[PDB]
Amino acid sequence: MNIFEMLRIDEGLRLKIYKDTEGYYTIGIGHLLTKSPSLNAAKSELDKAIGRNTNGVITKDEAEKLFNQDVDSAVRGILRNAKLKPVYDSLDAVRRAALINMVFQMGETGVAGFTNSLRMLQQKRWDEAAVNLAKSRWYNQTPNRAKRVITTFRTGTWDAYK
């Protein structure tokens, strides 16, 4: 298992514009298009992201291409962030994937906001970090996905994904 396979399981793949769990226009493997309510504003972001007139539909290759860019960006954002970087540097390979997953979902700003859980992960207090991570809107809104990520932080294995 790796970060790509992990995120593909959590996000799914859809080739037509759809609304995510928050009601926002998305496409592909979890690629947020816009927070605006307008489907036209979403189609316009889509065409711009793909470089062609898509009429709201993309191919598998185009989905995978946005996905590779989004993972790359999540990693680079973590490495640029003064709060996240030290946590990432301290973790083993599996747990690094869990952190990337959270950043991919909620953005660097949102994750950097989990001040206490970050400190706990850095200190390697797995059980305590898992309890603190669950006291969040994140966990309450998307509990099945949150549990999978949290178990990955707790155990350092891919068991939740197998």
Annotated binding site for substrate: 32, 104, 117, 132
User: Residues 22, 138: contact at Cβ < 8 Å?
Assistant: no
Cβ at position 7, least distance to Cl ion in Å: 14
Q: What residue has token string 């995978």?
A: 64
What share of residues in the chain are helix, strand, coil (percent, to 5)?
65, 10, 25
Nearer to Cl ion, 49 or 102 (CB): 49
Q: Is 70 a catalytic residue?
A: no
Cβ at position 143, least distance to Cl ion in Å: 6
Question: What is d(CA 86, CA 135) in angstroms, rounded to the nearest whole number?
Answer: 23
Q: Does residue 142 bind Cl ion (CB under 5 A)?
A: yes
Q: From the list 145, 149, 153, 160, which residue makes contact with Cl ion (rule: CB under 5 A)?
A: 145
Name the strand (E) or helix (H) holding 52.
none
Q: Which of 42, 53, 50, 35 is nearest to 17 (CA)?
A: 42
Q: Is 11 a catalytic residue?
A: yes
Cβ at position 147, least distance to Cl ion in Å: 8
Catalytic residue among 20, 47, 64, 128: 20
Nearer to Cl ion, 145 or 154 (CB): 145
Q: Does residue 144 bind Cl ion (CB under 5 A)?
A: yes
Binders of Cl ion among residues 46 to 85 (CB under 5 A) are: 49
Question: What is d(CA 152, CA 162) in angstroms, rounded to the nearest whole number?
Answer: 11
Q: Which residues are catalytic?
A: 11, 20
Interacting residues with Cl ion (CB under 5 A): 49, 142, 144-145
